[PDB]
Nucleic acid binder design. Structure first.
Ligand SMILES: [Cl-]
Ligand SMILES: [Mg+2]
Ligand SMILES: [Mg+2]
Lengths: 297, 303
RNA sequence: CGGGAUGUCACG
DNA sequence: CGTGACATCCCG
RNA sequence: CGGGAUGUCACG
DNA sequence: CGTGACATCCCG
C-alpha cells in the first residue's frame, strides 16, 4: 500500500470524536458545535447516595479539550441560556471527583432556563428512581438540532449559536434509558428513547408524549446506541414495565422544599419554605415534617 | 477499572467518524447529515492522465455505509441541488476503479448547480494545474454550515435538508491545499485554505477573496488538518509562492471546447463546437486547432 | 472539466 | 422493482 | 434536585 | 487574568 502511505504523509484530519472517559461518565465531544455529542453514564442506588456537595463545584472548561474547540463560561452567562449538564450532578453524590467532572463544559449544553431545572430535571429524577426497581441503569444523553418544515414544503434546520465561540443551542434533547432488573436475571431489558424540545413545558404533558423508537432517534442523531446490545434478543418498552411518569406539581414542589432544608443553615430559611409551601396551596406531607423538626435544632 | 467495564458493558455509542480509505482518497462520513465531513486526496502529473471516463460511471450509495445513514439519488434528483463530488473524478483519470469510488454518495454534497460546474470546478482545475509546478499536492475538501447574524444581533445557523433522508445542504464549502515542490528539496511547503459560499459565482472574484487562515478554518469546521505537519517550521502562503488565479471566461470555455473534441462522434458535431467558440468572440489557440484538425481527420476516414 | 435528460439489450 | 454496458442528446 | 447574583481570604 | 476552597442571598 505505497499509495496509501503518500496519502497519509501528513496525517488524516482529526475530528476529536474519540470517546473521553471520566470517573463516572464518558462522552464524545463535538469540536464544531462546542457541545457533547453523546454522554453515557451508569446509575445505581449505591451512587446516588453520598456527601458530595453541588455548591463546591464550578463550571469550568474541560482541560482535556483543546482551548480552540472548547467553550467557556463567558459564552453562557447572560446569553439568555443556561448551562445544562447531561450527566446529572445528582447521579454522583458518592464521589466528589465524579461530581466535579460533571461540571466540565464538555458535559454541558445550552438549555432553556425553565426546562433545565423544570421538566428535564424531573426526567433526571425519574432515572434515579429506577434504581429502586433495577440494579443497573444506563443513560445516554445529548443535544439535537432538528429540522422543521415550513409553508413552501422544504425543511430547514435552524439553531442559535451564543458567545464568541458560537456554542450551538440545540432545538431538542434526547435521553435513552436501558435498564436491567438484576445482575443474575435474564428478564428482557427495559429500553426507552425520548426527545424533548429545549423550552419550558410544564406539568401537563406526560413523559410518554416525548417517547420515540430507538432506530428513529438513531436516524435523527446519526448515532448507534448500545452496539453490544443483542437486538435479536427480546427487549421491552421501559414504559410497559414501569411508570414513565414524572412528579406532579405537588410532589415536585415538596421534593425541592424537602431538599432545600438540607442546605438551609439559618432558621429563617426554614420559615420562608413553609410560607412558600402555604403560598403553594400544598399540604405538607408528614415526611417533610419529620425532616422539618429534626433540622430545627 | 471495574466501574468502567459496567459503562462499556453495552458499548459506547457509535459515531461512524472513522476514516474510510479508497483507491485515491479517504474521508470521514457524517451519519447525521448524510454527507462527508472531510475528504483527503493526493494528485500528481501521473494521476490526472488516463483513459477513465466519467460517462461510464454512476452515482450510487457507498456500499460500506449502512443504508440507515446513507444518502440515495432519490434525495438529490429533483431537490434543486446538484451532486457535487469533493474528491474530483478528473483527479483520478488513471484508474477506472478510483474514479468510480468518487461517485459514491459518501463523497458527495448538495451543491448549487452553477457553483458545481463553474467556480468550484475552476478551483479543482487550479489544483490539477499545480501539478505542473509541484510534484505532490494534497487537498482536503468538505462542507460547512456557518452562522449568520440577524438584525437583532442573534447568530443563526440555517440550512436546508433535502429528500427523505434529510441530506444537509451546506452554506459554504472549504478546501485546504498543501503542496511540496519536490520530495528531495526542502523549499518551505506552501499552504492555502479557502471557504467559498454554496451559490453561483462568476469570473470576477479572485480565489484570494475566499482565502482564510488555517486556524480560522479549523475553528469553523471543528477539524485539525494535516496533524503531522510541523507548524513551527517555515510554511508559506500558496498565493504568494504561486498564482491563485482561476481561469477567466475565455480560457475556461476554451478548455471545455477542447475536452469536447474527444467526444465528437461526427464531423458535423465537431464543427458545432467551433462555431460556438466563434459565436462567443473567442479565437481558438494553436492547441485547439491541432486537436480540432486531428479529431476532424480521424472522423473523416471512417465516414 | 463539471452537471443533467433519455432510450436499447442482457440478466438477477 | 432492482444490476450491469452500449448508445443519443442538453446545459455552464 | 436544577440553575443564577454577590463577597473575604490564599496562590500561580 | 488565570487556578484551587470558605461563605449568603435570590429563583422554579
Ligand atoms: Cl436534479
Ligand atoms: Mg440540568
Ligand atoms: Mg463538482
Amino acid at each position: 500500500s505505497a499509495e496509501k502511505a503518500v496519502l497519509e504523509q501528513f496525517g488524516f484530519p482529526l475530528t476529536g470524536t474519540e470517546a473521553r472517559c471520566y470517573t463516572n461518565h464518558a462522552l464524545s465531544y463535538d469540536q464544531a458545535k462546542r457541545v457533547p455529542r453523546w454522554v453515557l453514564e451508569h446509575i445505581s442506588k449505591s451512587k446516588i447516595m453520598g456527601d458530595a456537595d453541588r455548591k463546591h463545584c464550578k463550571f469550568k472548561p474541560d482541560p482535556n479539550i483543546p482551548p480552540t474547540f472548547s467553550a467557556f463560561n463567558e459564552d453562557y452567562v447572560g446569553s439568555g441560556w443556561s448551562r445544562g449538564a447531561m450527566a446529572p450532578a445528582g447521579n454522583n453524590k458518592f464521589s466528589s471527583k465524579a461530581m466535579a467532572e460533571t461540571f466540565y463544559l464538555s458535559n454541558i449544553v445550552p438549555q432553556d432556563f425553565d426546562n433545565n431545572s423544570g421538566y428535564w430535571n424531573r426526567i433526571e429524577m425519574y432515572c434515579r428512581e429506577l434504581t429502586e426497581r433495577f440494579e443497573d441503569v444506563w443513560v445516554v444523553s445529548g443535544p439535537l438540532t432538528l429540522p422543521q418544515t415550513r409553508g413552501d414544503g422544504k425543511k430547514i434546520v435552524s439553531y442559535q449559536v451564543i458567545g464568541e465561540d458560537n456554542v450551538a443551542v440545540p432545538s431538542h434533547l434526547y435521553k435513552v434509558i436501558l435498564a436491567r432488573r438484576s445482575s443474575v436475571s435474564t428478564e428482557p431489558l427495559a429500553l426507552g428513547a425520548f426527545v424533548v424540545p429545549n423550552e419550558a413545558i410544564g406539568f401537563q404533558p406526560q413523559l410518554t408524549e416525548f417517547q420515540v423508537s430507538l432506530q428513529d432517534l438513531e436516524k435523527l442523531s446519526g448515532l448507534v446506541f448500545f452496539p453490544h446490545l443483542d437486538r435479536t434478543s427480546d427487549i421491552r418498552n421501559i414504559c410497559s414495565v414501569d411508570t414513565c411518569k414524572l412528579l406532579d406539581f405537588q410532589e415536585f414542589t415538596l421534593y425541592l422544599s424537602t431538599r432545600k432544608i438540607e442546605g438551609a443553615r439559618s432558621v429563617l430559611r426554614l420559615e420562608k419554605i413553609m410560607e412558600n409551601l402555604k403560598n403553594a396551596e400544598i399540604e405538607p406531607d408528614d415526611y417533610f415534617m419529620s425532616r422539618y423538626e429534626k433540622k430545627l435544632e
